[PDB]
Symmetry: D2
């Protein structure tokens, strides 16, 4: 069965004000491209072409101006609004008609991933047609996240949302793969004491039915989020160091679409034209004649 | 005589696309606050309260949403549009009625300044009620700028806009103080070979009449570059290092207004309220009870 | 057959003076640990325990003070001097008696690697008991390196040392695996026009005999070198971002030895003792009770 | 009267191990030059030519190899050892015969200063031929330092070394100017509860006699932190940003000596020769023909 994608690029409330007073966090650049390019590229790398972008009423037209309907990149993008930030699990109610009877994947609009064989890590989660798949990653500050606990055999046995005393240093990352049960689970969720529909409650529902796969995302992968001004800056520096070293870009959607064969050489050449006088368009042009393994 | 301020926050064309596709460069954050806070703070530090913000037609309402009429900060802000990026000198034609018969100051919306006694450096330019004052700063790449040449006595003798063979390494920074002659000079400007109304032509008009003061902005000042992705990132890191070392902010307009006595303690306390859950509001609150020299 | 390691941590001449006037480049820290810890950790990750450190006459005792005989980490370290910087291929002549009749691996003392399944990438090169194995990596500036050219089938067909017009963007990284033929090949090398015994000439000798394996090190790996002051700084920032995100260290030799089972819990506890009041010793202590996948 | 300088470049214990296992912190580079160049340049900027460098027994010959007797730079450098890190005030006992009956200045070997008119700020402290002068700087973490308390009139009224409950956010920086009384005061000091001869006790002695001038080092100056790996890295980035923006170096001793007229053009040209193949020597060469204001 095919899998649809959702990017949640909602309000980060007032947390990063005044930097985010004028625009949405997920429109801020990480080095050389808007933040949302990164999770969008993540969905694309998982082979997902039909994608719903959920944002605030105010910023939706700005996402639309940036991304269009996706057709330029071999995608089909649709848009939905989240009037109020009522929790990550709300994506499934807002996205209910978009999803229909299909499999799905949710990615947070401010999550960046980097590493070798990421494509294959995503592929193996995408091919699991039943149940749910999340990724666990070792962090310094697991108390900020959904935390997964494992028994001595390596099996996930509990999930806790922002525990004061984390059972491990393994956080659940902001990338989630779901079967056709997720909308019904989300519909039956009640708000938590913070007034939010919690994704962790969704994941625990799968866990209790023995249908949650927790794959380790190893330390050789970088999972960056952009939760503070400091971490945003570090994410920019990280991407810049890689791109300036390699002469290759991270999360260039045009490149990914070209490599997935969703667009061809002539379409890529046309996409390069408007940006030909800057490094980004020069990069797209170089992609036409260079072999990159 | 009073001096009015103008902030030119216009289009950077396609140079930083796709990062700047969604929103204007001068609304992007530098570390923890929108870029435009920095030149705005520069004008305020010069004692300027009546300020015209010029931007593109698309982004004007976003500057308006962010900054309002200024009254919350003891300022009087007005707004105007630049339909096409036809040169920095265009600010004086767009801003003609705003300026009237008063003295003026122009700052570029993407210029950041830092250093000791910057207040005094601006004060001494502001008090010159005749002629014009600009600042020259030693840079590695003077070709990118208006370049000033000095004779052996230290007197400015020529200005060249983006010369292929710069006469010195001294660039004219994006901060300009003018008397009542600037509008009339701007009205008589003809477009350059690049189709732009050049500020450098304005400055050369004053130079030929012996009325251009070119002050050296010494190497102990930081005039930070935001022209490239790399330089944007370096500026964010520079500001973060200073703020995290000192526990004091650079270019916090609320603080500057409070210290200029344009707003009082009770007004500052009210401004802190909406942001009380984050570091920026906590900073404003701390300013009410701490003596800072 | 067993494989011995060599780390070349020689003079970088005057290239980074005055920063390197007082000490060797490979003793400078990258974030929180001396540079040489990184390539040392790379050899360890490849399963190599018997390692020759080649440095200048002046700095050998400083490497010795830092690293000792290796016994604290389950290694056996020996030391050799390189009086004059006569080329990377000289490591095999200086290291001839150390190597004996064994397989070998050479790593440059200023090369840093990071990425997922690096262990497995190294393992597959280490298990090739005949011929030579190098890694090719896409860089922005291949003209600074040994460059490998591939035919349409992906087969390596030429190697060029620092070509003005590189045949590809694939540089040979500073990690090299060799069979028992390398010493004899090195002995027959004549100095190049720059007066150096070139590693690229060694690699081309294997290529001509059909015994060079060129494995791609993919873009999901970070290969950093520290060839300039700028790149050194970027390498520090890169490592710090990863370690501060994960609460896990890159190239902690004590950790690697513990995970390879070369030292046990009680030995690791003793190594933690001297450093117990700083973050590094606290990290080693935490490793005793935490499960990390 | 003439004023002699002392640079205290002693042990940082184990705090930054293993990075500092091999070599002293003050020999590590900050961006492009050894750390000690920065405080050395600070003394030079204050017009001080006769300078005692105090370090550990192990690292003294390395400071000597780097700096020599100073004669190449128009300085007269001498050397002395601190066997154990028994407090900053120990500098005056070790340095007693060097100081003699002259005025003095102490700078810590890991303190970096930057800002406009720093020369003048140092000059005005240097010209005070009686009493002592220190500088107070607003910091986020005053507990780490000597902390100065001021009454409502702005007068310094107490000094506390590393108070658990700081009376202000004003730290005393690691630059101190003293009259002929300091040696005798240092001789009468008793160790504190931490077993250290405290500079803060020296400064309090002057305070009680009404002879401590506490000048504010304003927020437009950078007093950069090198106490942690993170802060070391931030300092390197800060210096790189300034130097790469300006094409001018911070704390180039050859430049400062040339500008003070302590060495002439021909001597500077000779100093450039050995480094002519790298940016540092190219910079010195450029200084011979460029006017820099
Ligand atoms: C953030 C992000 C989004 C999408 C992919 C990746 S990645 O797998 O770590 N990575 C560096 C990457 C790639 N590996 N690739 C190559 C690639 C593209 C399509 C399919 C398989 C490989 C790419 O075109 N762009 C990339 O950013 C990172
Ligand atoms: C970019 C910029 C904008 C406004 C001020 C400055 S500044 O003078 O270099 N600077 C660090 C600074 C200050 N010096 N001050 C203190 C100050 C406030 C009002 C008048 C004179 C000084 C402040 O309140 N905010 C500041 O950002 C830099
Ligand atoms: C620079 C470097 C040196 C050695 C390993 C590595 S690495 O494979 O990219 N990496 C992050 C890494 C690890 N993967 N590991 C875990 C590990 C240790 C030993 C065997 C297999 C795995 C580790 O203990 N330290 C590491 O630095 C990087
Ligand atoms: C750390 C430090 C050490 C010495 C000077 C300085 S500085 O005054 O802030 N500074 C940027 C600086 C300078 N201002 N100058 C110019 C200068 C040289 C001699 C006397 C007065 C000024 C210089 O030649 N080198 C410098 O590093 C900072
Ligand atoms: Cl890869
Ligand atoms: Cl200056
Ligand atoms: Cl891994
Ligand atoms: Cl100041």
């Amino acid at each position: 069965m095919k899998r649809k994608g959702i990017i949640l690029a909602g309000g980060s409330g007032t947390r990063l004000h005044p930097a985010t007073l004028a625009i949405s966090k997920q429109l801020l650049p990480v080095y050389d491209k808007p933040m949302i390019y990164y999770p969008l590229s993540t969905l694309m790398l998982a082979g997902i072409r039909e994608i719903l972008i959920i944002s605030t009423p105010q910023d939706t037209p700005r996402f639309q101006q940036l991304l269009g309907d996706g057709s330029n990149w071999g995608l089909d993008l649709q848009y939905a609004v989240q009037p109020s930030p009522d929790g990550l699990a709300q994506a499934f109610l807002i996205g209910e008609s978009f999803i229909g009877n299909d499999l799905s994947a949710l990615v947070l609009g401010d999550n960046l991933y980097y590493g070798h064989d990421f494509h294959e890590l995503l592929g193996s989660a995408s091919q699991r047609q039943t149940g749910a798949s999340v990724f666990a990653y070792h962090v310094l500050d697991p108390e900020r996240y959904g935390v997964v606990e494992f028994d001595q055999g390596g099996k996930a046995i509990s999930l806790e949302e922002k525990p004061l005393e984390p059972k491990s240093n393994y956080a659940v990352t902001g990338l989630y793969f779901y079967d056709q049960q997720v909308v019904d689970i989300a519909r039956d969720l009640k708000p938590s004491p913070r007034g939010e529909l919690e994704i962790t409650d969704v994941n625990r529902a799968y866990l209790e039915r023995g249908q949650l796969s927790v794959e380790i995302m190893g330390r050789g992968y970088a999972w960056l989020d952009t939760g503070t001004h400091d971490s945003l800056l570090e994410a920019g520096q990280f991407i810049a160091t890689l791109e300036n070293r390699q002469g290759l870009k991270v999360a260039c959607p045009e490149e990914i679409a070209y490599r997935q064969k969703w667009i061809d050489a002539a379409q890529l050449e046309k996409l390069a034209a408007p940006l030909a006088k800057n490094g980004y368009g020069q990069y797209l042009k170089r992609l036409l004649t260079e072999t990159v393994y």
